[PDB]
Amino acid sequence: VFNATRFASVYAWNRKRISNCVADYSVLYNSASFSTFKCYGVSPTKLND
Amino acid sequence: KNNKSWMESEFRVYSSANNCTFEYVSQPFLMDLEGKQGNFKNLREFVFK
Numbered sequence: 001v002f003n004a005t006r007f008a009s010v011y012a013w014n015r016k017r018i019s020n021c022v023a024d025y026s027v028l029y030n031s032a033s034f035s036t037f038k039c040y041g042v043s044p045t046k047l048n049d
Numbered sequence: 050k051n052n053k054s055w056m057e058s059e060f061r062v063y064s065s066a067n068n069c070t071f072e073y074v075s076q077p078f079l080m081d082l083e084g085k086q087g088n089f090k091n092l093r094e095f096v097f098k
C-alpha cells in the first residue's frame with residue numbers, strides 16, 4: 001500500500017481491497033515518512049485497539 | 050489412461066468469478082486419486098452452519 005514502487009494517477013485512482021489481516025500501524029504513524037497523516041473520525045493512537 | 054496414474058484434467062464448476070471477498074488455499078499436498086475397489090472404507094461427516 002504505502003511502499004509500492006509506483007502509485008496510480010489520480011484520474012485513474014486504484015482501489016486495493018484488504019481482508020483477513022491485522023492493522024498494526026507502528027511502522028507507519030510512528031514514522032516521520034508522511035508529511036500528512038489525518039484521521040477524521042478516530043484518534044490515530046486508537047487504530048490499534 | 051496409459052500413464053498408469055489417474056490424473057485430474059477437467060474442472061467445470063464455474064465459468065467466471067468477478068467479485069472476490071475471501072480466498073484461502075491450503076499448503077499444497079499430493080492426495081491419491083487411485084481407483085480403490087470393494088466396499089466403502091472412509092466415513093466423512095460434515096456439519097455446515
Ligand SMILES: *[C@H]1O[C@H](CO)[C@@H](O[C@@H]2O[C@H](CO)[C@@H](O)[C@H](O)[C@H]2NC(C)=O)[C@H](O)[C@H]1NC(C)=O
Pocket residue numbers: 067068
Ligand atoms: C463487480 O463487478 C460487476 C461487473 O463489472 C459490477 O457490476 C457493474 O456495476 C456498475 C455500477 O453499479 C454498473 O453500472 C454495471 O452495469 C455493472 N455491470 C455488470 C455486468 O453487472 C459490480 O458493481 C462490481 N462490484 C464491486 C463491489 O466492485
Ligand SMILES: *[C@@H]1O[C@H](CO)[C@@H](O)[C@H](O)[C@H]1NC(C)=O
Pocket residue numbers: 050051052056
Ligand atoms: C499422461 O500424462 C501426461 C503428463 O504427465 C499428459 O500430457 C498426457 O496427456 C497424459 N495422458 C493421458 C492419456 O491422460
